Amino acid sequence: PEEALIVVDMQRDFMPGGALPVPEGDKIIPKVNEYIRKFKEKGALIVATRDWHPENHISFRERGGPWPRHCVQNTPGAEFVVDLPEDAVIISKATEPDKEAYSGFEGTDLAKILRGNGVKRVYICGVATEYCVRATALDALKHGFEVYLLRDAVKGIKPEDEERALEEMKSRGIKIVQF
Domains of the chain: 1-179 (3.40.50.850)
Residues that constitute the known binding site for Zn(2+): 51, 53, 70
CA distance between the termini of the chain: 20
Say if CB 24 and CB 16 are below 8 A apart: yes
Q: Which residues pair with 50 in a beta bridge?
A: 92
Closest CA relative to residue 125, chosen from 34, 23, 37, 7 = 7
Residues that constitute the known binding site: 51, 53, 70
Indicate which residues carry an active-site annotation.
9, 132
User: How far apart, in whole angstroms, are the C-alpha atoms of residue 168 and residue 163?
Assistant: 8
Closest CA relative to residue 149, chosen from 52, 115, 161, 168 = 168
φ/ψ bin of 2: left (φ > 0), alpha (ψ from -120 to 50), beta (otherwise): alpha
Overall resolution, Å: 2.0
| Strand (E) or helix (H) holding 168 | helix 159-172
Say if CB 44 and CB 5 are below 8 A apart: yes
Count Cα atoms within 13 angstroms, Cβ side, for 151. 10
Q: Which amino acid is at 160?
A: E
Say if CB 82 and CB 99 are below 8 A apart: no
Q: How far is CA 93 from CA 6, 46, 110, 169, 171, in A?
A: 14, 17, 10, 22, 27
Backbone angles phi, psi at 50, to 5 degrees: -145, 140
Closest CA relative to residue 155, chosen from 19, 31, 18, 67 = 31
